[PDB]
Write a protein that binds this ligand. Sequence first.
Ligand SMILES: *[C@H](O)[C@H](C[C@@H]1CCNC1=O)NC(=O)[C@H](CC(C)(C)C)NC(=O)[C@@](C)(NC(=O)OCc1ccccc1)C(C)C
Ligand SMILES: *[C@H](O)[C@H](C[C@@H]1CCNC1=O)NC(=O)[C@H](CC(C)(C)C)NC(=O)[C@@](C)(NC(=O)OCc1ccccc1)C(C)C
Lengths: 303, 303
Amino acid sequence: SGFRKMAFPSGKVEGCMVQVTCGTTTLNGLWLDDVVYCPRHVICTMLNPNYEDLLIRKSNHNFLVQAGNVQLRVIGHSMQNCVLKLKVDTANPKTPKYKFVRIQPGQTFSVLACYNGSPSGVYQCAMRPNFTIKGSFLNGSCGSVGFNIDYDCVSFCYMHHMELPTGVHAGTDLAGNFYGPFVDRQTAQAAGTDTTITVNVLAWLYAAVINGDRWFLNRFTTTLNDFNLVAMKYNYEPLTQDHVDILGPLSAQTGIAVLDMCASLKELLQNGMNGRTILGSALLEDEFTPFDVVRQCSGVTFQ
Amino acid sequence: SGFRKMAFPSGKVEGCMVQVTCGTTTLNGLWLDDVVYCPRHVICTMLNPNYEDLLIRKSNHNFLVQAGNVQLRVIGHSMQNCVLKLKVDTANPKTPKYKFVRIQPGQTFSVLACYNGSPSGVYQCAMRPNFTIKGSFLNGSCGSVGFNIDYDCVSFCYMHHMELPTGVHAGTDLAGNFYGPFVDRQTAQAAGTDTTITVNVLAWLYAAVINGDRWFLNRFTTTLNDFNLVAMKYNYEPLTQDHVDILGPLSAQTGIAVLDMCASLKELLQNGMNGRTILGSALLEDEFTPFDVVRQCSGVTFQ
Ligand SMILES: *[C@H](O)[C@H](C[C@@H]1CCNC1=O)NC(=O)[C@H](CC(C)(C)C)NC(=O)[C@@](C)(NC(=O)OCc1ccccc1)C(C)C
Ligand SMILES: *[C@H](O)[C@H](C[C@@H]1CCNC1=O)NC(=O)[C@H](CC(C)(C)C)NC(=O)[C@@](C)(NC(=O)OCc1ccccc1)C(C)C
């Protein structure tokens, strides 16, 4: 038993991390097949760039691409939105089955923080409703990727770009399109009002239940509206009937009805946690999707 | 910026995970060079085993050892304490530079949870003072390892064995010796009274400081004794003058004296956190060593 913030095993992505330098700018890139995806501000030197005039003045030989102790030779470059696909002369032998995928807020993905093309650490994140992530990134970590793994296949969904002034982060998917109203430019931009992910907090409460944490339950129940009218008050995000659908097998395995656990989340929101924790946490924790909980509380592996 | 519970990148260990079956018992093993280290209860079928009479009745051919889609042939077996070194005829090509190391309580290590030899997830842990870890393990996860990584070298320090009745876990180092008063046997055993790791909580407070969380600081200071006499009250573990030494570069980079942050931790312990968080947490968090914080708040990589 037990319940941790678990990342995906990071080995498949490590073999795809490379160093990309251009001028006095160095960041991380993603080497899949014979293409090295990196952020596009690497061609910069950031207040108000026209990226189309910057890329047209570049040539192949401006991009230093370091795959460890091996320089990679670029043979063509193109900008798809806010990413650079530099296609090179070696296809990466550790390329794995993969997919580029665009996630929805609430969904969670492992992040492989990188510097100079060397993985530094791995941690789990969630796409906040306001299209930010709260991770750990220093100068030199751009081009780090975020990703889930489904059996043997690697769904890249995130590439780090920039830190907003509240210490949150913003980045694209791998087709190059920013999540949210964020632009790769040193102009005032701000995350937006964030909300809590109601469907993940209930999952997590189910994750407590499977693990002997039952202090926050009750006899009570209520209806989806009556609770969503309290979800709004405490800045949680609306619960749909389609959310309840996805919280079924959890409610199956534990025999606690979704509307009852909502009623229990009510209780908790309106009363706080009065000097206790759930799952080692004194806060309500919305970065565990329903599919996370059943991965972890039931042990699916990957190979 | 930002501050997450970051695991080590898990790629080096993945290439060392194998499946070991014996009878109707299957668990994980660690394939380094031509030796497959696994727990020794795999020879079991658990109330009161003499493991020396169990191993002597075994033969090489009883150990099914599955390295994915390749059966590995054991050619000799030996029990070093609570582990089985089954030496096999193939030396693992993904063996990396490694060390077997025995950690001290307070120290933290990445854990690569495995089932059927397939890594399931990776998370960071700390060796609790009572020689337990709080991780995430289901039936079939024994022989998972815990580990730090120093440049290119992999210090294995943990192998999962058993869950205690409070949902905590206990396991050995890789020489086979249990951390603490725990035995690989289905007899009543209990973790012991746990304490909080005072030197890690101050590190974490320093980790808040570097990141714009200054609400818990103050002008005050006090002496090491006067605070350790409160550390006892709130079940924290004694702070030494050698701990203060290790909390130096943090106190260097931020210009906050160690005795002042102690004074600030006092304040917090005696008053609680009155409706705020530090680093996204409403609790005081002792699973970040001083060397963690500077790894993360300064970006050391690995290759
Ligand atoms: C690439 O490694 C680097 C990584 C960030 C540095 C620290 N954390 C990161 O994720 N990316 C940048 O340096 C990025 C560059 C672009 C602006 C995207 C081209 N810069 C930033 O993240 C900064 C400059 N912030 C902003 O870009 O703008 C938001 C803003 C600017 C001015 C006033 C208000 C808001 C810094 C926060 C580093
Ligand atoms: C190997 O995968 C397996 C992994 C544990 C199962 C769930 N989490 C784990 O880490 N290990 C065991 O099944 C282990 C076997 C030995 C006892 C070590 C040989 N068994 C346990 O963990 C159990 C049986 N607990 C105990 O071993 O004993 C403590 C105890 C027993 C009885 C009364 C009080 C305390 C279970 C908790 C699974």
